[PDB]
Amino acid sequence: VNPYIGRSPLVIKSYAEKLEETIAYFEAQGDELNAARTRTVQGIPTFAWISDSATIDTIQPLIADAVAHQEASGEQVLVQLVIYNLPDRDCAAKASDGEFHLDDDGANKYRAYVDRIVAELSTADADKLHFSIVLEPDSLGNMVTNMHVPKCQGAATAYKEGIAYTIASLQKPNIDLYIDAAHGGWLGWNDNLRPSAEIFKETLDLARQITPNATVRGLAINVSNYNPYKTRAREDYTEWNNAYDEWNYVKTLTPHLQAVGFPAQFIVDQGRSGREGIRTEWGQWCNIRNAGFGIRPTTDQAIVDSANVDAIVWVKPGGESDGTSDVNAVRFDENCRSPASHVPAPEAGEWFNEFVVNLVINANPPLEPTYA
Ligand SMILES: [Mg+2]
16 A cells, blocks of 8 residues: 555654744844745654664654654654665766775675664664665666676675665564656666666565565655656657656556565655756756755655656655765765756755755745744
8 A cells, every 4th residue: 555645654753943043044134035935844743864874873863753743733744754874885986975885794794784773673773663765876777787886786686685685674564665767867767677676676586585475565766867858848868868856756657566565655856856958967966056956745646647657755855965075085076066967066965045045935835824
């Protein structure tokens, strides 16, 4: 069943608190409407990212808060998590902050990291909640398009085995799993569709060798990207790609999933998808200037318009930087000084207030204000 129907995805308190800085900015500008729109954003659920082992410490307090909120509100709280820590993570990138490396016992360390997450998701409080979990952004797409990269060659089996273990470890009636499936500009190209479907099925089959009847709900798409759900003005860079918006990516990928016997249900990130025409190349990803908040999280089929889409969601939390633009930073990524990038920008994950200001202003549909 679509686990989003009737459920109330969890508002992440630590994220909402960061937005107080954005509210303060707008109030100082004498801009009460945008201050009020920012308050609306405080009440919009986002995914909590578990991108390292230290962040596992945040999970039980998050669950305790979620249970208290469920008791107070009478809602069916749906905790949304991203698991993002494969060994030799981000294999095609020049650099990765992933803490596990295959040559330093990374496969076994990843299993234990998963095991630590499982322990937190197996408490009496956890049992009271429902979870939606996105598995491993920036992973399996690399096996489709980046097998000429030595690091990807050496990580391919590990990515499949790692995700397989995560799937096999999180089979519970109150957990739905979505394997990350990149975005239309990566895997939507004609020649990438079938091998993508095949690798998702291959990974699920490996999971079933660990836990016999293991399943996933489907796929997560556009995570951390900017692609529109339905484009208003198709971009020139999408020429010869039938997945020129994320709704079309669903429609174009679905038949291949069906053909290989992989579940064809999707959740779609639209947290930074409000404004189009912000990039000159599809591969630009880092802090794209003038990005807007997109369609708010919803299951409404009048918007979603696809039996294959469970929900539009906000996975990457807008305002958390994609990377620093400082040329001298230890983790400097040249992509973060692209012609389309918002500069200056802070370290990946750090608060980028100027960028959130623009996310509010460029939101589409416009944000409805929340007034006290
Ligand atoms: Mg490191």
